[PDB]
Design a binder for this molecule. Sequence first.
Ligand code: HEM
Ligand code: HEM
Ligand code: HEM
Length: 72
Amino acid sequence: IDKITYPTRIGAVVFPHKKHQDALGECRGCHEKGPGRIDGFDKVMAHGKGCKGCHEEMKIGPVRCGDCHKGG
Ligand code: HEM
Ligand code: HEM
Ligand code: HEM
């Protein structure tokens, strides 16, 4: 499993998981409580430190709505 798709009303988001693990070369950063499900992962988390927040800080990755949400 390399890609994780999040089906959302506003347009589905595809998370290229392997790309991220290869790019960051670490697990604990995103998986604070050890690799596995991330408890409480939702819209607010994704728009925050869960997804968009990192892209803004690292200045790489999608930060604009449509660069994540695609498919109508
Ligand atoms: C080799 C290091 C990594 C390991 C072993 C790992 C492992 C996993 C596993 C086992 C899953 C599936 C969990 C499930 O089905 O509930 C997953 C999901 C996920 N991983 Fe990783 N991961 C790694 C690195 C990363 C990195 C670097 C990020 C952050 C850029 C990340 C973010 C996520 C997210 C957001 C999910 C979905 C969580 C959820 O749906 O609750 N992972 N990862
Ligand atoms: C201000 C611009 C954005 C808007 C207006 C927006 C809007 C939304 C909305 C309304 C939801 C809730 C689900 C739905 O109603 O369909 C959502 C979920 C989510 N958004 Fe965004 N989003 C934006 C930017 C982003 C960006 C840039 C990313 C990717 C880095 C992203 C990733 C996600 C993810 C992964 C979820 C699903 C979380 C879950 O499955 O619980 N969004 N977004
Ligand atoms: C589930 C939440 C996240 C979503 C939906 C997401 C989505 C994406 C997508 C679609 C790309 C662009 C891939 C491409 O170049 O085609 C990307 C790239 C990237 N993201 Fe995320 N991301 C998430 C979380 C994170 C987190 C938490 C970090 C930092 C702690 C991060 C760091 C990066 C970096 C470094 C890249 C460049 C990877 C590359 O192009 O090789 N992302 N992200």
